[PDB]
Scaffold this active site. Structure first.
Site, PDB file in Angstrom:
ATOM      1  N   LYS A  22       5.005  -6.292   1.077  1.00  0.00           N
ATOM      2  CA  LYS A  22       3.593  -6.440   1.321  1.00  0.00           C
ATOM      3  C   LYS A  22       3.031  -7.531   0.585  1.00  0.00           C
ATOM      4  O   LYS A  22       2.284  -8.447   1.077  1.00  0.00           O
ATOM      5  CB  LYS A  22       3.169  -5.086   0.949  1.00  0.00           C
ATOM      6  CG  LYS A  22       1.447  -5.005   1.024  1.00  0.00           C
ATOM      7  CD  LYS A  22       0.967  -4.019  -0.002  1.00  0.00           C
ATOM      8  CE  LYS A  22      -0.368  -3.634   0.025  1.00  0.00           C
ATOM      9  NZ  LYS A  22      -1.216  -4.705  -0.666  1.00  0.00           N
ATOM     10  N   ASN A  23       3.259  -7.591  -0.534  1.00  0.00           N
ATOM     11  CA  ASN A  23       2.793  -8.438  -1.609  1.00  0.00           C
ATOM     12  C   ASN A  23       3.031  -9.651  -1.801  1.00  0.00           C
ATOM     13  O   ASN A  23       2.863 -10.613  -2.783  1.00  0.00           O
ATOM     14  CB  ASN A  23       2.591  -7.447  -2.918  1.00  0.00           C
ATOM     15  CG  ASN A  23       1.686  -6.466  -2.948  1.00  0.00           C
ATOM     16  OD1 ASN A  23       0.727  -6.310  -1.941  1.00  0.00           O
ATOM     17  ND2 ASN A  23       1.580  -5.461  -3.797  1.00  0.00           N
ATOM     18  N   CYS A 115      -6.711  -0.921  -3.211  1.00  0.00           N
ATOM     19  CA  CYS A 115      -6.453   0.190  -4.052  1.00  0.00           C
ATOM     20  C   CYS A 115      -7.631   0.493  -5.200  1.00  0.00           C
ATOM     21  O   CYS A 115      -7.836  -0.258  -6.016  1.00  0.00           O
ATOM     22  CB  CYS A 115      -5.091   0.235  -4.729  1.00  0.00           C
ATOM     23  SG  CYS A 115      -3.841   0.099  -3.452  1.00  0.00           S
ATOM     24  N   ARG A 120     -11.052  -3.547 -11.155  1.00  0.00           N
ATOM     25  CA  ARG A 120     -10.248  -4.561 -10.661  1.00  0.00           C
ATOM     26  C   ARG A 120     -11.312  -5.934 -10.652  1.00  0.00           C
ATOM     27  O   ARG A 120     -11.465  -6.311  -9.240  1.00  0.00           O
ATOM     28  CB  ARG A 120      -9.749  -4.116  -9.138  1.00  0.00           C
ATOM     29  CG  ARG A 120      -8.695  -3.058  -9.431  1.00  0.00           C
ATOM     30  CD  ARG A 120      -7.956  -2.892  -8.061  1.00  0.00           C
ATOM     31  NE  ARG A 120      -6.920  -3.712  -7.839  1.00  0.00           N
ATOM     32  CZ  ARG A 120      -6.144  -3.909  -6.716  1.00  0.00           C
ATOM     33  NH1 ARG A 120      -6.424  -2.952  -5.745  1.00  0.00           N
ATOM     34  NH2 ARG A 120      -5.244  -4.830  -6.497  1.00  0.00           N
ATOM     35  N   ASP A 305       3.302  -0.315  -9.741  1.00  0.00           N
ATOM     36  CA  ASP A 305       3.488   0.100  -8.178  1.00  0.00           C
ATOM     37  C   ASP A 305       4.504   1.156  -7.927  1.00  0.00           C
ATOM     38  O   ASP A 305       4.446   1.669  -6.634  1.00  0.00           O
ATOM     39  CB  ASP A 305       3.533  -1.153  -7.035  1.00  0.00           C
ATOM     40  CG  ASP A 305       2.271  -1.787  -6.803  1.00  0.00           C
ATOM     41  OD1 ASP A 305       1.213  -1.304  -7.166  1.00  0.00           O
ATOM     42  OD2 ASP A 305       2.101  -2.628  -6.109  1.00  0.00           O
ATOM     43  N   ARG A 397      -1.171   0.618   4.832  1.00  0.00           N
ATOM     44  CA  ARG A 397      -1.537  -0.698   4.205  1.00  0.00           C
ATOM     45  C   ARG A 397      -0.154  -1.375   3.533  1.00  0.00           C
ATOM     46  O   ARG A 397      -0.129  -2.505   3.314  1.00  0.00           O
ATOM     47  CB  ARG A 397      -2.318  -0.532   3.179  1.00  0.00           C
ATOM     48  CG  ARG A 397      -3.660  -0.006   3.586  1.00  0.00           C
ATOM     49  CD  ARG A 397      -4.782   0.047   2.371  1.00  0.00           C
ATOM     50  NE  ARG A 397      -4.706  -1.447   1.714  1.00  0.00           N
ATOM     51  CZ  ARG A 397      -4.970  -1.798   0.390  1.00  0.00           C
ATOM     52  NH1 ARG A 397      -5.071  -0.724  -0.305  1.00  0.00           N
ATOM     53  NH2 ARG A 397      -4.861  -3.061   0.007  1.00  0.00           N
TER      54      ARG A 397
END
Ligand SMILES: CC(=O)N[C@H]1[C@@H](OP(=O)(O)OP(=O)(O)OC[C@H]2O[C@@H](n3ccc(=O)[nH]c3=O)[C@H](O)[C@@H]2O)O[C@H](CO)[C@@H](O)[C@@H]1O
Ligand SMILES: *[C@H](C)[C@H](O)P(=O)(O)O
Length: 419
Positions: A22-23, A115, A120, A305, A397
């Site tokens: 995903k990242n 998230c 953030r 994570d 997601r």
């Protein structure tokens, strides 16, 4: 709004094929805004964030299509303001800013979402672009950046390690005039993957994976074909699934070296782990895992994570173990929910003290972010009875077909729609 109804307990064992990260897929998709020739990105997971990113790129004027691979032609991009609705739903949207300013001289993007595990901020992204020559103003929630001509290379000493800001600075520097040196750079495998993707397009980058990245700017980037690396967090999630259910699993299409810290903690928990060039196997030999102590930190240390998932592991393990979260300040929402399933934990500042119990009990639970939601689903698999996890779109997601993958491991799971 969809929910997952899970019937437990079920020992999870078998195999799973890991999807692309995903990242890594996300920063690579936004880095493609720099490309002035068509690009084929292979092994892109089918995730909600990828769908959001493809729509966002399309709204900027890029031609985007997909299946296993995504094809992007950003040659005719002609809109430089990212749409609020797509920007606010995820974190990755912040990555549209740097490429737009680096290639077109301007970009406007609202503060991102994603998230809900901390405030953030994006101050490091802003500071890095400013050091490269961009003028930035925040107005009515939009970060507006501009530069007359090309950005200029600079020696940037990041005063905090940040995955996202390292990506923003690295990608924008590829089109700057001169050399950029990023100090205290994040070392995550996805940063290495994004750098290698950029190099494929013609960028000049070295040091990716270390605390110092050097970028020599070029006039323009071309195109290419690139395969996204395996998702280490998905891999870790399934390894934990097998560990807590005293099962065994083989993860295919994996990349072992992205998980040194996680594999070491699983071995400390009693898991028998073997690895190959592209696979990882875990076998508990029918034993309950032993509690472990963990402290999150930037790569190569234990990843934040994987923190909610290891909290779950400790809560069903033998003994007491602690989980210290140093990366985000509001990432313990899974704890009260697991407590309702019979877990025993105390939160002391940034640390959760876990006292493992033999078995959890099913309950109606809900998580407000991706990894916490996945953790509750895993808990449901091993808990006694019925567990209903609400708001599972958060899982979409970051996990491609988690339902199908868990079912193939023996889980009794159903996606229930509309009440
Ligand atoms: C889309 C994506 O890749 N998401 C991952 C990325 O997010 P993300 O890129 O947002 O993670 P960061 O590394 O930037 O954040 C780490 C810490 O730095 C702070 N910070 C960050 C940026 C900034 O400008 N100012 C600032 O103060 C944060 O609020 C946090 O307290 O790395 C995180 C840490 O491995 C992962 O948990 C996310 O899943
Ligand atoms: C949860 C932290 C997700 O990975 P993000 O995309 O919001 O960062």
């Amino acid at each position: 709004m969809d929910k997952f109804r899970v019937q437990g307990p079920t020992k999870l064992q078998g195999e799973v094929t890991i999807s692309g990260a995903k990242n890594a897929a996300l920063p690579i998709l936004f880095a493609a805004l720099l490309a002035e020739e068509p690009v084929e990105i292979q092994n892109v997971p089918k995730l909600k964030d990828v769908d959001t990113s493809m729509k966002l790129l399309s709204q900027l004027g890029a031609k985007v299509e997909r299946x296993g691979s995504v094809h992007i032609d950003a040659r005719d991009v002609n809109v430089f303001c990212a749409p609020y609705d797509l920007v606010k739903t995820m974190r990755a949207s912040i990555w549209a800013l740097g490429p737009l300013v680096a290639r077109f001289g301007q970009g406007q993007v609202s503060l991102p979402g994603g998230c809900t595990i901390g405030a953030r901020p994006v101050d490091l992204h802003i500071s890095g672009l400013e050091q490269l020559g961009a003028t930035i103003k925040l107005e009515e929630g939009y970060v507006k950046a501009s530069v007359d001509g090309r950005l200029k290379g600079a020696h940037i000493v990041m005063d905090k390690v940040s995955v996202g800001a390292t990506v923003t600075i690295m990608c924008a520097a590829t089109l700057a005039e001169g050399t950029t040196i990023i100090e205290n750079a994040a070392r995550e495998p996805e940063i290495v993957d994004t750098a290698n993707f950029l190099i494929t397009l013609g960028a000049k980058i070295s040091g990716q994976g270390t605390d110092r990245i050097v970028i020599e700017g070029v006039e323009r980037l071309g195109g290419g074909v690139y395969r996204v690396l395996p998702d280490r967090i998905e891999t870790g999630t399934f390894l934990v699934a097998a560990a807590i259910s005293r099962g065994k699993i083989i993860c295919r299409n994996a990349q072992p070296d992205t998980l040194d810290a996680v594999l070491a903690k699983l071995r400390d928990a009693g898991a028998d782990i073997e690895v190959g060039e592209d696979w990882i196997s875990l076998d508990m030999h029918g034993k309950r895992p032993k509690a472990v102590n963990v402290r999150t930190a930037p790569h190569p240390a234990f990843p934040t994570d994987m923190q909610a998932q290891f909290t779950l592991l400790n809560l069903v393990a033998e003994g007491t173990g602690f989980i210290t979260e140093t990366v985000f300040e509001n990432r313990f929402m899974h704890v009260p929910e697991l407590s309702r399933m019979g877990a025993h934990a105390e939160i002391e500042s940034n640390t959760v003290i876990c006292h493992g119990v033999e078995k959890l009990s099913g309950a109606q639970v809900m998580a407000t972010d991706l990894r916490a939601s996945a953790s509750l689903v895993l808990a449901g698999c091993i808990a006694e009875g019925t567990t209903v996890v609400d708001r599972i779109y958060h899982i979409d997601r970051g996990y491609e077909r988690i339902e199908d993958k868990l079912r193939a491991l023996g889980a009794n799971i159903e996606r229930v729609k509309g009440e």
